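Dissemination and training. As part of the outreach component of the grant, students in the summer workshop were shown how a complex can be specified as a set of sequence lines and then modelled as a single object. The example used during the hands-on session is reproduced here so that future cohorts can follow it. Participants entered these lines:
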Amino acid sequence: VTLGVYLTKKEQKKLRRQTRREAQKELQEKVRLISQGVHISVYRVRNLSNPAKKFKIEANAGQLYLTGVVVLHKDVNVVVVEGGPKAQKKFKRLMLHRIKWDTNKCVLVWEGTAKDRSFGEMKFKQCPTENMAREHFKKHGAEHYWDLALSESVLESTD
RNA sequence: AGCUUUGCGCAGUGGCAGUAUCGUAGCCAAUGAGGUCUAUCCGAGGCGCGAUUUGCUAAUUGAAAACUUCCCAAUAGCCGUGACGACUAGUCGGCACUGGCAAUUUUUGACAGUCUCGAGACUG
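and obtained this result:
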């Protein structure tokens, strides 16, 4: 709604002169007297068993005030984050360029916009089977992203 | 959380500040100011006009260099002498001075300088 009001250097300079003049006058007088849409990303990594990388991902999720989950399974790590656009962009730039995995590769499965946040805080869930992770994702209403990540992992393993 | 890029105003230093700079209530703008470059062209105002804050303090000239009373006329002990009284020609107490008060015991200065651990010594 509001627009930024910028001026040229000369105009500013005139203001400075006036400002200093006013200041001098005063001095001389003192001496003389996440709502409306939240960005939700979901990335798929081959191996997330490293404690240092998981701690760095948890620190990047907690410092950016973004919620979500990090589910681990048999060669399928689904990291879902949700928050603002700048926090999601910083998390994607950290997980795509700063977080060095290497046969272990991390790629972003999906990145969209939702109405509100689903999870409360970043909880590192763990499940050896995919049915428990699917039930944990459906308990918070995010089973479609986990199913899409599992289908993308199956298509990457088959092809 | 640290760090970095950049600008404004403000704070500090430095720097220039009569080819130094702003002011404009004038005038032509990134739809485009204005090229002699580059005129399928650069891209910023063009070029007029109006001119170069405030405060401290010194110094100079002059009779006087500006901070809220002059002047007059004037001012705010002794030795002796003459009377008076007292005590036996003398003495005492008070009054004024018709003369004096720089020559050893009193008031016209034998004073000054230097040194040592209240005291002493040396010199002129």
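Helices of chain A lie at 9-32, 51-63, 85-98, 130-139, 143-158. Students were then asked to discuss how this feature might be tested experimentally.
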